[PDB]
Amino acid sequence: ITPATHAISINPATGEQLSVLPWAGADDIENALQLAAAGFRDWRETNIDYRAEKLRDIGKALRARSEEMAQMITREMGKPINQARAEVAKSANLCDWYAEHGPAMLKAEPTLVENQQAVIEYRPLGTILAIMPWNFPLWQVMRGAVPIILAGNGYLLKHAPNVMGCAQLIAQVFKDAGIPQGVYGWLNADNDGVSQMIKDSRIAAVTVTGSVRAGAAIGAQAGAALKKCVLELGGSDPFIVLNDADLELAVKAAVAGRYQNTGQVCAAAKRFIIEEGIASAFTERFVAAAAALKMGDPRDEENALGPMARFDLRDELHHQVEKTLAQGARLLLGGEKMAGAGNYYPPTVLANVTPEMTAFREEMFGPVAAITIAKDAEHALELANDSEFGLSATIFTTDETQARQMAARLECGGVFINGYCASDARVAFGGVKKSGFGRELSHFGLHEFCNIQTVWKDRI
Amino acid sequence: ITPATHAISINPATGEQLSVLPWAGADDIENALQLAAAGFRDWRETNIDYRAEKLRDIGKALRARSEEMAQMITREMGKPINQARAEVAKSANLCDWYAEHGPAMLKAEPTLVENQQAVIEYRPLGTILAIMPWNFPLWQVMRGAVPIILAGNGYLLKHAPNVMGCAQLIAQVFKDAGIPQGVYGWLNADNDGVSQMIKDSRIAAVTVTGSVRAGAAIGAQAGAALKKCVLELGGSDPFIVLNDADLELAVKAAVAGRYQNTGQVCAAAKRFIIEEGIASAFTERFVAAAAALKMGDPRDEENALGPMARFDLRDELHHQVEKTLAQGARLLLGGEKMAGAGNYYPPTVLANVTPEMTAFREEMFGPVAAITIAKDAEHALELANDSEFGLSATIFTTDETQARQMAARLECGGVFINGYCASDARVAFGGVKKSGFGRELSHFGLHEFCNIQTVWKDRI
Ligand SMILES: NC(=O)c1ccc[n+]([C@@H]2O[C@H](COP(=O)([O-])OP(=O)(O)OC[C@H]3O[C@@H](n4cnc5c(N)ncnc54)[C@H](O)[C@@H]3O)[C@@H](O)[C@H]2O)c1
Ligand SMILES: NC(=O)c1ccc[n+]([C@@H]2O[C@H](COP(=O)([O-])OP(=O)(O)OC[C@H]3O[C@@H](n4cnc5c(N)ncnc54)[C@H](O)[C@@H]3O)[C@@H](O)[C@H]2O)c1
């Protein structure tokens, strides 16, 4: 069994093979598209309040399998078990939040046209094809699926090939909730199967969460097929610390921001840009706090980090570390693959990272922090924006005026001032530049895949 | 002077060559990209109220050359002079409308996050590349340029090669208004130049109004370069008349909707779908009302129709008519090229048009009406959605409940009930399916090319 024929699950903590699943054939793809078409046809006619109730049924079904879901996440991609439980809880609360606030976001919108002649309606678009990654096997799916389905659309998941056990579990949860299989479906399609579905008329639009290379390859096919796409393609988020900052809170938020999910977060704090006056105190405190993180078996709740999900990606990450050191960076912590059958990489800190270095120009999708010195606040802003990515950012300073001014000049989709960066249903999510385009969550995730339809009566 | 080397303007009323313009070279492309990046860098730092005032300056500069602009539009693409003056007036009013209402649409947006810790901000994205067509040489530019610039973005126009006289005049209007260097620019680029700019990092996003073939070609490039794009690619709008409709008003709106701008409108009434009970009366009234339209020299205000804009497109439209007649349709009016040096095509009506015929499946971008009989309202809805396009639609019926129900099932971005289909700053514009995606005008045209940015303080 090889990836050329099957999707393979391997426990990254032990290296043992878990499951295999062959790619969907031509009959599977045709059957999936037929049921998605029939499902949307009936789902688009349901009441908005009925769909809001079905969202609550999803949240109830998810909580009824919360531990079964979290264990599957931890087993397949190595997430610490309490972070997998938090992912389940966050995904279930998302169902309840959209159930309460979603309908009001989908109400018809009045216009300034006289005599109440014109309103704006949010109509369903069709079946949305979703390409999702492995770092949050449940949350990445629910973040789009919940608002997409509430808007009357269908959702067809093409999950990452190393988390198909999570994909089947999610499908079972939707089945438990009474969601018709044409409204929520899934396929184990290879890249050619995705290309075929993008060209198929039964797919209305596409959404992609993954690498820059995956978004560029899929975004070109969606544009060629005249399908709207939303791309969320990770980032290299800057974490700015000025001299007047709450240093202790900044270090806590820096450590959590970088090493959450063993570093494998799109909006993780990756480029730490510290003003020169406070850089020595920050660096020493950051290394001390990163060194206090326990790493090991993700089923053991005492471990803050588990193994990295993919063996090839740990090799890639370590190669990036070696290149950055060879270019002139200094190693302050970790920086070597752990011996054993597990895919473990320890918390790592690189200092003296200049903008020409690998760890500054590429996404470090693992437990490796890069620390860059800034001459002043203007240099820090320039350093923050000197990146191909632009998903999110953090600024730590007690001068809230300068913080508001820097936020307005940061080329990214989210700015956190003196706090922990995270995605939340109540705020928009998504970035600019090579991080992609399109916004998720809040009312943005509801409207991105809606036919915004003007209805105008008696225009005479 | 071959189109392979020059952009050529030809007066369609006479056939005389007006002007030539060589394609921009590599230097000209690089120059404009540099000035656009420099212009945006300074424009994004200005106050919103300053830019709103400059919008009022654009409207003043446009009205100051209103007759010069309208005569240029009529001369280069053949629009009747009164419709060209109306285009100028509608474009200037768009400047004042966004100047008044735009700033409020760009204010920070509150969230449900407790204690007012998180707001949504609408930041500029960058320089927007615009690919525009010849049917509304001014309005198509202003519909995007006014909101795009107001939100702090830059605007780089690649106009259609037969209306470069209009493009230069438009640039003179922005220069008269004092719009800075690089905020509004334009290039006489060929298709390779557009490809070069899409791949360039100084272009943040693309917008395209034109054919389906152009949108698929440009949209594929935008996705491959990870640039968001908005595509408005014309349509084959259905015009449904049920048995209980106000026949007199329906006929007036049908004629106005089809033969406006000599039929060269993306949201024109193209496929007339009439219930069998009223079909005979509607058809006879439509032929008689279309026959009362005067056609001739577009500088003469008595003429409701001018010549078609492009000689090759009249040849293609007539080929579409000949194919539809050969497929079984009946000719009720017009249906033959006018002899002479002008590019004149008379008002044309085709009856017995079935869904398998050319005039039903392709866009008839000229003064040719296609009439299809529907058995009942359910059949009319099926006939309306049986199309690759989906820009807009019209329903005429005194049963307003049935009209609203059909509007919810019409696969298009705009539905007009008992009125005249048109675009308006106060409502959304844009469609679905092969008509493209994304919305223009109102707050949609402002937000499509904004960096929607979450700003969240003290998330602890
Ligand atoms: N949160 C994120 O944005 C995120 C998540 C995981 C990985 N990544 C980035 O991607 C890197 C590699 O991890 P990865 O290999 O899993 O990313 P990936 O893009 O290759 O996998 C992401 C998803 O896209 C799909 N995909 C990839 N190429 C495709 C194609 N040509 N056609 C159709 N579908 C395609 C994959 O099957 C998967 O479902 C990581 O190191 C990280 O930099 C980002
Ligand atoms: N309002 C509209 O949506 C609209 C306007 C004009 C034409 N059309 C449709 O298109 C048909 C032909 O008219 P047209 O020739 O002007 O359409 P067109 O698409 O060829 O021209 C539209 C614009 O797109 C540009 N363009 C086209 N192909 C391109 C490419 N490969 N790369 C870069 N830029 C490209 C053109 O230069 C022009 O500026 C019409 O008969 C009608 O069906 C629609």
Residue numbers in the entry:
A (entry chain B), B (entry chain A): 3 to 462
Give the published text:
The NAD(P)+-dependent succinate semialdehyde dehydrogenase (SSADH) Sad is a member of the ALDH superfamily and oxidizes succinate semialdehyde (SSA) to succinate. In microorganisms, SSADHs operate in the degradation of various nitrogen-containing compounds such as putrescine or arginine, where they prevent the accumulation of the toxic SSA intermediate. Our results show that Sad is a surprisingly flexible enzyme that is not only able to detoxify succinate semialdehyde and glutarate semialdehyde but can also functionally substitute erythrose 4-phosphate dehydrogenase in pyridoxal 5′-phosphate (PLP) biosynthesis and glyceraldehyde 3-phosphate dehydrogenase (as well as phosphoglycerate kinase) in glycolysis under physiological conditions. We show that Sad, which primarily functions in the detoxification of succinate semialdehyde in various degradation pathways, does not only accept closely related substrates, but also converts phosphorylated sugars as a side reactivity.
We next purified the WT and Q262R variants of Sad for biochemical characterization. Both enzymes possessed high activity with SSA (~90 μmol min−1 mg−1), the native substrate, which was unchanged for the Q262R variant compared to the WT. Even more surprisingly, when testing the substrate spectrum of Sad, we noticed that the WT enzyme was able to directly accept E4P, notably at four-fold higher activity (50 nmol min−1 mg−1) compared to D-erythrose. Moreover, in the Q262R variant, E4P dehydrogenase activity was increased 17-fold compared to the WT, reaching 800 nmol min−1 mg−1. Both variants were also active with glyceraldehyde 3-phosphate (GAP), showing even higher activities with GAP compared to E4P. We hypothesized that this increase in gene dose resulted in increased intracellular Sad activity so that Sad could also oxidize sufficient E4P in vivo.
